[PDB]
Amino acid sequence: LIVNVINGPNLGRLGRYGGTTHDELVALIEREAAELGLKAVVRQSDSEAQLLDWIHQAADAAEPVILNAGGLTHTSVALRDACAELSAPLIEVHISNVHAREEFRRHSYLSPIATGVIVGLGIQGYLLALRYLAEH
Amino acid sequence: LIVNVINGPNLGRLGRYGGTTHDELVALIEREAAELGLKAVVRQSDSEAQLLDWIHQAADAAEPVILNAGGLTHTSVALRDACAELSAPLIEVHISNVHAREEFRRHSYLSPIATGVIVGLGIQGYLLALRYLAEH
Amino acid sequence: LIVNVINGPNLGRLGRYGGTTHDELVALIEREAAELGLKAVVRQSDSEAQLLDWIHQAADAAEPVILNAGGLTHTSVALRDACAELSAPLIEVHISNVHAREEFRRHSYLSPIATGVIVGLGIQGYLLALRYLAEH
Amino acid sequence: LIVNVINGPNLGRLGRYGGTTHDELVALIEREAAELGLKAVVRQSDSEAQLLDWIHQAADAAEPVILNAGGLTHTSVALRDACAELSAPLIEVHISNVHAREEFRRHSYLSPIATGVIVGLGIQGYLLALRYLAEH
Amino acid sequence: LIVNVINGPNLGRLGRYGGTTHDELVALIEREAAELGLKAVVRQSDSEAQLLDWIHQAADAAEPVILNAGGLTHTSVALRDACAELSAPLIEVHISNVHAREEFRRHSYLSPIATGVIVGLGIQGYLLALRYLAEH
Amino acid sequence: LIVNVINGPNLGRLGRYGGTTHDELVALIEREAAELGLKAVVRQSDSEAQLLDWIHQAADAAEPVILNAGGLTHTSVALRDACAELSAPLIEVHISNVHAREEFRRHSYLSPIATGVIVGLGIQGYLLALRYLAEH
Amino acid sequence: LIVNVINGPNLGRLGRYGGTTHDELVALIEREAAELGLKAVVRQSDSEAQLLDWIHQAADAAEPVILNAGGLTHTSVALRDACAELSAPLIEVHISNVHAREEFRRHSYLSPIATGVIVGLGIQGYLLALRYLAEH
Amino acid sequence: LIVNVINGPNLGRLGRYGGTTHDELVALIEREAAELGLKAVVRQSDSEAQLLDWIHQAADAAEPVILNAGGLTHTSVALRDACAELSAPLIEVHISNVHAREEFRRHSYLSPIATGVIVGLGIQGYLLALRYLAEH
Amino acid sequence: LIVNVINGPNLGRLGRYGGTTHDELVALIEREAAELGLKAVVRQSDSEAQLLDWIHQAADAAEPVILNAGGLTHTSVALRDACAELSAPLIEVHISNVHAREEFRRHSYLSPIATGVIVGLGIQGYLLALRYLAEH
Amino acid sequence: LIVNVINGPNLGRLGRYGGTTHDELVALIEREAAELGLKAVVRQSDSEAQLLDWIHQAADAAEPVILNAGGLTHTSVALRDACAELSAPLIEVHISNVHAREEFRRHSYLSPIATGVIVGLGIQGYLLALRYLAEH
Amino acid sequence: LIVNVINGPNLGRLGRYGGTTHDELVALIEREAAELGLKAVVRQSDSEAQLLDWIHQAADAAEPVILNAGGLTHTSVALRDACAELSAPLIEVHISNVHAREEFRRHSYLSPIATGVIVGLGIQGYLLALRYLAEH
Amino acid sequence: LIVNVINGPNLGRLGRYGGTTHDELVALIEREAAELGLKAVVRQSDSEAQLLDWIHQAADAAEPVILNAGGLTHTSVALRDACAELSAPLIEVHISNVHAREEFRRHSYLSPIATGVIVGLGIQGYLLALRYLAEH
Ligand SMILES: O=C(O)[C@]1(O)C=C([C@H](O)Cc2ccccc2)[C@@H](O)[C@H](O)C1
Ligand SMILES: O=C(O)[C@]1(O)C=C([C@H](O)Cc2ccccc2)[C@@H](O)[C@H](O)C1
Ligand SMILES: O=C(O)[C@]1(O)C=C([C@H](O)Cc2ccccc2)[C@@H](O)[C@H](O)C1
Ligand SMILES: O=C(O)[C@]1(O)C=C([C@H](O)Cc2ccccc2)[C@@H](O)[C@H](O)C1
Ligand SMILES: O=C(O)[C@]1(O)C=C([C@H](O)Cc2ccccc2)[C@@H](O)[C@H](O)C1
Ligand SMILES: O=C(O)[C@]1(O)C=C([C@H](O)Cc2ccccc2)[C@@H](O)[C@H](O)C1
Ligand SMILES: O=C(O)[C@]1(O)C=C([C@H](O)Cc2ccccc2)[C@@H](O)[C@H](O)C1
Ligand SMILES: O=C(O)[C@]1(O)C=C([C@H](O)Cc2ccccc2)[C@@H](O)[C@H](O)C1
Ligand SMILES: O=C(O)[C@]1(O)C=C([C@H](O)Cc2ccccc2)[C@@H](O)[C@H](O)C1
Ligand SMILES: O=C(O)[C@]1(O)C=C([C@H](O)Cc2ccccc2)[C@@H](O)[C@H](O)C1
Ligand SMILES: O=C(O)[C@]1(O)C=C([C@H](O)Cc2ccccc2)[C@@H](O)[C@H](O)C1
Ligand SMILES: O=C(O)[C@]1(O)C=C([C@H](O)Cc2ccccc2)[C@@H](O)[C@H](O)C1
Ligand SMILES: [Cl-]
Ligand SMILES: [Cl-]
Ligand SMILES: [Cl-]
Ligand SMILES: [Cl-]
Ligand SMILES: [Cl-]
Ligand SMILES: [Cl-]
Ligand SMILES: [Cl-]
Ligand SMILES: [Cl-]
Ligand SMILES: [Cl-]
Ligand SMILES: [Cl-]
Ligand SMILES: [Cl-]
Ligand SMILES: [Cl-]
Ligand code: NA
Ligand code: NA
Ligand code: NA
Ligand code: NA
Ligand code: NA
Ligand code: NA
Ligand code: NA
Ligand code: NA
Ligand code: NA
Ligand code: NA
Ligand code: NA
Ligand code: NA
Ligand code: NA
Ligand code: NA
Ligand code: NA
Ligand code: NA
Ligand code: NA
Ligand code: NA
Ligand code: NA
Ligand code: NA
Ligand code: NA
Ligand code: NA
Ligand code: NA
Ligand code: NA
Ligand code: NA
Ligand code: NA
Ligand code: NA
Ligand code: NA
Ligand code: NA
Ligand code: NA
Ligand code: NA
Ligand code: NA
Ligand code: NA
Ligand code: NA
Ligand code: NA
Ligand code: NA
DSSP states (O other): OEEEEEEOTTGGGOBOOBSSOHHHHHHHHHHHHHHTTOEEEEEEOSOHHHHHHHHHHHHHHTOOEEEEOGGGGGTOHHHHHHHHTOOSOEEEEESSOTTSSOGGGGOOSSGGGSSEEEESSTTHHHHHHHHHHHHO | OEEEEEEOTTGGGOBOOBSSOHHHHHHHHHHHHHHTTOEEEEEEOSOHHHHHHHHHHHHHHTOOEEEEOGGGGGTOHHHHHHHHTOOSOEEEEESSOTTSSOGGGGOOSSGGGSSEEEESSTTHHHHHHHHHHHHO | OEEEEEEOTTGGGOBOOBSSOHHHHHHHHHHHHHHTTOEEEEEEOSOHHHHHHHHHHHHHHTOOEEEEOGGGGGTOHHHHHHHHTOOSOEEEEESSOTTSSOGGGGOOSSGGGSSEEEESSTTHHHHHHHHHHHHO | OEEEEEEOTTGGGOBOOBSSOHHHHHHHHHHHHHHTTOEEEEEEOSOHHHHHHHHHHHHHHTOOEEEEOGGGGGTOHHHHHHHHTOOSOEEEEESSOTTSSOGGGGOOSSGGGSSEEEESSTTHHHHHHHHHHHHO | OEEEEEEOTTGGGOBOOBSSOHHHHHHHHHHHHHHTTOEEEEEEOSOHHHHHHHHHHHHHHTOOEEEEOGGGGGTOHHHHHHHHTOOSOEEEEESSOTTSSOGGGGOOSSGGGSSEEEESSTTHHHHHHHHHHHHO | OEEEEEEOTTGGGOBOOBSSOHHHHHHHHHHHHHHTTOEEEEEEOSOHHHHHHHHHHHHHHTOOEEEEOGGGGGTOHHHHHHHHTOOSOEEEEESSOTTSSOGGGGOOSSGGGSSEEEESSTTHHHHHHHHHHHHO | OEEEEEEOTTGGGOBOOBSSOHHHHHHHHHHHHHHTTOEEEEEEOSOHHHHHHHHHHHHHHTOOEEEEOGGGGGTOHHHHHHHHTOOSOEEEEESSOTTSSOGGGGOOSSGGGSSEEEESSTTHHHHHHHHHHHHO | OEEEEEEOTTGGGOBOOBSSOHHHHHHHHHHHHHHTTOEEEEEEOSOHHHHHHHHHHHHHHTOOEEEEOGGGGGTOHHHHHHHHTOOSOEEEEESSOTTSSOGGGGOOSSGGGSSEEEESSTTHHHHHHHHHHHHO | OEEEEEEOTTGGGOBOOBSSOHHHHHHHHHHHHHHTTOEEEEEEOSOHHHHHHHHHHHHHHTOOEEEEOGGGGGTOHHHHHHHHTOOSOEEEEESSOTTSSOGGGGOOSSGGGSSEEEESSTTHHHHHHHHHHHHO | OEEEEEEOTTGGGOBOOBSSOHHHHHHHHHHHHHHTTOEEEEEEOSOHHHHHHHHHHHHHHTOOEEEEOGGGGGTOHHHHHHHHTOOSOEEEEESSOTTSSOGGGGOOSSGGGSSEEEESSTTHHHHHHHHHHHHO | OEEEEEEOTTGGGOBOOBSSOHHHHHHHHHHHHHHTTOEEEEEEOSOHHHHHHHHHHHHHHTOOEEEEOGGGGGTOHHHHHHHHTOOSOEEEEESSOTTSSOGGGGOOSSGGGSSEEEESSTTHHHHHHHHHHHHO | OEEEEEEOTTGGGOBOOBSSOHHHHHHHHHHHHHHTTOEEEEEEOSOHHHHHHHHHHHHHHTOOEEEEOGGGGGTOHHHHHHHHTOOSOEEEEESSOTTSSOGGGGOOSSGGGSSEEEESSTTHHHHHHHHHHHHO
16 A cells, blocks of 8 residues: 655756656656555655665565665665565666666666666656556 | 567466466456557567567567567577667566576666666566556 | 487587587487487477477476587577476586687586586487486 | 678668668679679578578588678677588678677677678678689 | 596595495495496595595506596696696596586686586486496 | 878788788789779888878878788777878778687777778788778 | 865865865865855765755756765765766866775776866865866 | 774664664673773764764774674775774674675675674674774 | 684794794683683694595584684685585684785685684684684 | 976877867967976877887986876886886876776876876866976 | 705606606706705695695795796695795796696786796706896 | 897886896896807887887897887787797796786786796896707
8 A cells, every 4th residue: 555665866856867857756656656546655865874764664664665776776785785674565766778878877786686677667667666566 | 559569588488487378468468458559469489580570570660569588688689689770669578587586687688779678577567568658 | 218309509510529420319319218218309400499499398298308509508598598497307418528619618508507417528428418317 | 603691680671781772782792793703692591590501501512601690790609600610711791890889799709710800891891702702 | 447536625525415425436436337347446535635646647557537526626727737647538527516506616627628527417427427438 | 092001010021921021912902902093002110100190191181091000909099099080981901810819819999990890801801991992 | 156166075084185174175275266266165075965965056056066075986876977967067186196096996987977087186186176167 | 991883774773683683782782891891882873974973083082993884884985984094993893794695795895994804793793893802 | 612723724834923823822722712611622734635624523523613724715615615514603714804915815715604704803813703602 | 397298199189189289289388387487398209119218308307297198098008117217296187088988098007106197177187287286 | 055946736747848857857956056056955745735834944944945836826825825934035937838828827826925937948947046046 | 149138118227127227237148148158139129119120130030039028018919929920939038026016017918929938036037048048
């Protein structure tokens, strides 16, 4: 029933990844979750510690997480280790196709511990992740 | 309207990636495509040349492709170059989480030229790809 | 009782790896298998898909395989994944000593999933593999 | 007198490497070979096994080969080993400048066993290879 | 007629590579060599210098060697250089499949200078090596 | 009409790459250029600065260059940057097959900025380059 | 007119990079900016999120940034992506010569997206950056 | 007399590294420090900036630090540079054996600047570090 | 009760790692073990085979080992494989901080199979290891 | 008082790095040096030996050098070793941002021995270097 | 006056590095040392521990060492660390040109701690080392 | 009888590698060569082309060369290829121990084609090379 959507650094700047703003994204996700009979809790922080605290709470609550970690995807072992604690599914989401850009973006610390990964499908990636979780 | 789902080597062995057989997968995909108002053409070959011919035809027809290339994902430049010709969207799909296994599976020749990539969501990955294409 | 000997690309050219022709090799293997009280089914193809189909059938039949994949040894993830399905033993055979040539020949995708590997013992390698299987 | 021109995967799509179609290329090559007093046999396949069979026949016939292997250039040890059997000259041809694109295209399994290599001169590359062979 | 079987570090601990003890292995090898009409001299040391001395003596005597060097396989240039002096055949044997474990075990200093290599066939590997030498 | 043929270090030693001397090469190139209706200006220096000055002048004159840079092929960023200024075609030529020798010769700083590359066709490589330029 | 000088982790410890304190640095920068007819806004944080927020505000305001990111220079993709949004110039500044120390300090995620980089000129580096911006 | 024990990201989750909670760990450390005649100040944060501030204060106070940085061990140059300022001893502690897990955990930015490192001894690692400092 | 302290090559030279001699170290260790209610058996050899024999005996006796292997730490697969047999705890000890010196010293073949590792705490490292074992 | 500005290969082509010609650059530098109360001696050569001779003379005279070595930046150990002799400051200058182009341009042999480095600030880089030296 | 010449594994096999036997080498070295007014003590062992003991004794005696370590050159950190203790000069000698063979022979653990290195000058290398030491 | 001693870039600066000047070195070498009954021709240039010309002349004259190429040792394929033409012996000499400094100095393009190499023995290295050549 409850799903956590957690966005990391710079994702608050979506729109200004253009068109949709983060506020719009939250509204889309919430609308879509309601139709699926889920409740989406969508949060964004540029702070790794804040991110880690949200993940810790999903781990304690055994709630699933859809995570778009931004740059921390490629850099943060700490974030990986927090997510490795999740017992419910973890879907890694990237808006952009991370394999079509700089080589360094083709490595994720999260993918190996995620249930699955969706990249390059834009913001619909989040909606598709919600739908996976509604079937699982 | 028409979407090509193309599965590469070993994908004919799904079930015996267990539970669902390839015949079941075809039926699921077709059922789901019909609901979305699409027509899914689902094919599987262990032959790279056969794969290439299907991709060539999608390129000529400007039809979208959902491709799960199996091992060729990690090895075939030829397949990449055929897919690079597609003008409609190309969604790379892996059933398994390719980042949770051998290191060599973490590189795809296809990802950089794909619209996007879905891994580790099982066969629902294909359904989710269909839904992306129904919105695009 | 039944053992599959599968030879991959270029192995049909043995003799023209000189002296023994592939037809001779088949006759040697069959003669030796009969003495061991086995039946050897020996096949060769330059087609990866044909190879994969033979491996699929050995997997379904739970028959052991002696495989000399030729160049695909060093390149084919698809072949590896088909062989990874075998429940009976898989003996990788190379006629030449692959460690005494180009560096790229020193990596095999097959070895990690094989029961064992025999290289550099010429065609007797196949006979020795048959003898292993006759004890196991 | 007889020269084999062998084109690998995707080369059948030339034109749709734009302008000249493969049929046009065949006609150019044949016209040019006739002027040189050679007979050009020009073939294309997306199938590696078909390619290998053509190379095997050039090896048996001691005929020279001009080979544009497409993506297999960068991936196929099997193809290399077939070509390594050729006793007549082997000219590797690429239409595009393979050194001006992705890093992975800068490695060829064929170059070390080829007589020589022509890249980036477009389809005239094939004509220039024919002319080399007419002097050798 | 005479064949040297030389086992390196830790191979004296076989059994405690379980089931068969080194004493058992010696008895198996000797029994099998007698049937083949050979005399097997089987020795084991954890000392590299002792190993080197045995190899030096096989080189002086032009006797073949079956060598399972244990960890030194992956580390000892000195051992390689002693074995490179052997004029009779050198068969490298590993009980375990060295390609199915840690990456560092996939490199052998010995393979490039060995006649051939047998891995992963258990102690039967030694018997199979003896049989090769009985045909050569 | 005017084409610059520029040879770098050690190419003055051709003959003593044996048979043809550099003087012979110049005469062959000039003879062949005349037949093609071109004027070939052929120069050789062991001095990088001299080379750079010739390239600068071809850049100012918008004249094409056939360049065999010798060892500088593999080492000189300065030479690359001078050649990157050429607006007319740049054909990189190597007499020897640089892919059949030391690994370090398989990298060229020039190839990525050249129109194309001809290697391993001996001195005919230069003639073939002239012919390309006569068609372009 | 307005220029942002942003210092990252540990830069608050300057002096205790010795002699000048961060307070002194701020006073130098402000004095120098006034002479140039600019207004310098100088901030320091050990918090990446705080840094990111400052960069976001410079991006919204189209103000130039002089950034000395400290260790995050070498580690933070998130910081890079925030800076990649800046439309005004971005000058990366390091007090120390990062190429004269540990190898890991020779890579910057920022340099490729910066207008330019000044290292090893001490705190005068900041003054020199201000002067660049006063001319641009 | 005073020793700082600083724990980084995720270490607040110890117990839920299982059995002992962080509160228990603090009590153990304090009990043990008292017996040694030291005062242990034990702190934990998921925030790098908070960590850096604690390290800065130990540097100003010339107090020793026992640091278990969690994932930042493997990623944070900023943390390293703060710790490099410590004039009193710095003992790096890991509860788990970081060399028995993923390859990326086998590199620490901290070790080269630490006095020493204790890994894999569980929470007793902290007690053992305290005892080192009580002798130094 | 019984603990084996095993020192490898060059450790007999401690003092001439200065101050304490190996004889002193033995006396310290023995004194400390007695206080802990253990018996320490402390041995040193420059011979790998001797080392291996001691490890074999600890494995047979299920006694714990504190091992400072010296240079063999970084080189000996054989030693690793002997230690991998230990069923009681194995504590790797280095006197010096191996991460503050040459890069090659930052890899240990032993760490992945050790219970834990203590480096850079001088000879107190051994005492601290004894204390760990007295609690386990 | 006297400062040497030394430009390496291809820098004589500035303008035809566009807009400003090398003659203009010399005039700018001289004008700016005069204002600073310095005398700038500005030289350019495509010859490494000429460069080395200028550096040798600055070393003998203990004069500072601003060096833009062009491609030799990335290739010349000889140049580095000459510059390593300079006792006065050495400022490495690049007009372009060398970190925003080909990977090979991100390594400089000069940076580790330079006082500092300015890249990507265009020709103002030279003026800014002069100003550094006027303060030092 | 006294110089130690120490030869490592396989060097006892010189002659059977052909022509001169080790006994001959000893006689040459002794003859040459006498002429130089030195006393040469020449020893050879295939045992690393024996080697280490000889080096330890040269360190205690502050005697110079000429060392040809054979394969251990490329493998033994232990040997390096013993030699690093020598206060008198250490000349590394190789009979063969180690840079003209396998890539792995181009790395020596000894060179960085040696006074100097002579390779490829055959046994005269030892005589030349003696002469260096007679001048130093 | 005649031996060429060729010194490359920066070697003209010896003394200002301190103590002995290049003029002194020439006098030492000449004095020593005369005693050996040789004639030493000693030359130095900072110009690669000049170096190449000297090597070409030694190749034509079949005279031996002692070469200290300075930085070009590590960078110049052109120089290597000129030296590869020498039919008489080529001794590579370095004054400094190139293995005790920066990693990049541990690779020589010359060593693989040299007869032998002497490093780290100072200027006596040249004298020792002369003595080798006087015996060969
Ligand atoms: O495609 C993604 O969703 C991705 O996770 C996001 C980012 C950054 O947040 C990029 C970014 C930059 C500016 C505004 C919003 C997002 C990148 O750091 C990642 O590489 C990929
Ligand atoms: O997860 C996937 O969908 C993937 O594309 C599939 C394969 C292989 O087909 C694995 C396989 C093996 C046996 C039967 C069916 C599929 C693997 O080669 C790829 O690495 C990943
Ligand atoms: O030694 C082998 O058996 C091996 O599997 C075979 C090949 C190729 O088939 C080589 C080859 C080439 C020509 C004719 C027959 C075989 C090589 O591709 C492999 O590296 C090694
Ligand atoms: O330039 C070439 O001739 C080359 O051999 C060809 C290809 C592919 O065939 C590219 C391709 C793609 C689509 C249609 C035709 C050709 C690429 O795979 C190779 O990297 C280079
Ligand atoms: O499989 C083998 O035969 C192999 O040569 C043996 C070893 C070691 O001896 C492993 C070992 C460990 C304990 C007892 C006996 C053998 C390993 O060092 C090698 O990697 C592989
Ligand atoms: O094949 C070539 O044309 C090539 O450019 C030439 C050289 C050198 O000039 C080799 C050489 C050596 C001696 C005389 C003439 C040429 C090599 O440096 C390059 O690797 C290849
Ligand atoms: O030279 C710089 O300005 C640099 O950005 C700064 C740092 C750190 O902040 C180093 C540091 C450490 C302690 C106090 C102040 C600064 C290093 O992390 C970077 O590698 C280089
Ligand atoms: O073993 C350690 O103490 C280590 O420092 C800790 C971590 C993480 O904090 C792991 C972690 C994960 C969840 C809860 C607590 C700790 C890992 O990031 C490090 O690799 C090793
Ligand atoms: O710090 C250690 O205890 C270490 O195990 C020891 C050594 C060597 O034994 C160094 C040495 C050298 C001379 C005398 C005693 C010890 C080094 O080989 C290892 O890298 C580290
Ligand atoms: O940006 C620079 O100043 C740099 O030093 C210069 C060059 C070359 O000289 C590029 C060049 C090319 C053509 C004309 C002038 C300059 C490049 O070789 C370097 O990578 C960077
Ligand atoms: O050239 C040398 O002197 C060298 O030290 C010696 C060896 C070995 O001892 C080679 C060897 C092999 C057989 C008999 C004698 C020597 C090789 O291990 C080294 O790579 C080089
Ligand atoms: O030790 C040598 O003889 C060496 O060949 C010389 C140099 C340079 O010439 C170093 C140098 C620098 C200044 C004056 C003289 C020599 C270095 O470039 C090489 O790495 C080593
Ligand atoms: Cl990972
Ligand atoms: Cl790719
Ligand atoms: Cl693998
Ligand atoms: Cl290759
Ligand atoms: Cl090897
Ligand atoms: Cl390049
Ligand atoms: Cl980058
Ligand atoms: Cl580090
Ligand atoms: Cl390991
Ligand atoms: Cl460098
Ligand atoms: Cl080293
Ligand atoms: Cl080389
Ligand atoms: Na929630
Ligand atoms: Na999990
Ligand atoms: Na979308
Ligand atoms: Na279709
Ligand atoms: Na496309
Ligand atoms: Na599913
Ligand atoms: Na069958
Ligand atoms: Na299996
Ligand atoms: Na055989
Ligand atoms: Na034909
Ligand atoms: Na051939
Ligand atoms: Na063309
Ligand atoms: Na014997
Ligand atoms: Na041999
Ligand atoms: Na067995
Ligand atoms: Na001209
Ligand atoms: Na151009
Ligand atoms: Na030719
Ligand atoms: Na502002
Ligand atoms: Na920007
Ligand atoms: Na300053
Ligand atoms: Na405190
Ligand atoms: Na410190
Ligand atoms: Na514990
Ligand atoms: Na004991
Ligand atoms: Na164990
Ligand atoms: Na201590
Ligand atoms: Na001057
Ligand atoms: Na200097
Ligand atoms: Na400018
Ligand atoms: Na002695
Ligand atoms: Na020393
Ligand atoms: Na000699
Ligand atoms: Na001469
Ligand atoms: Na030669
Ligand atoms: Na000297």
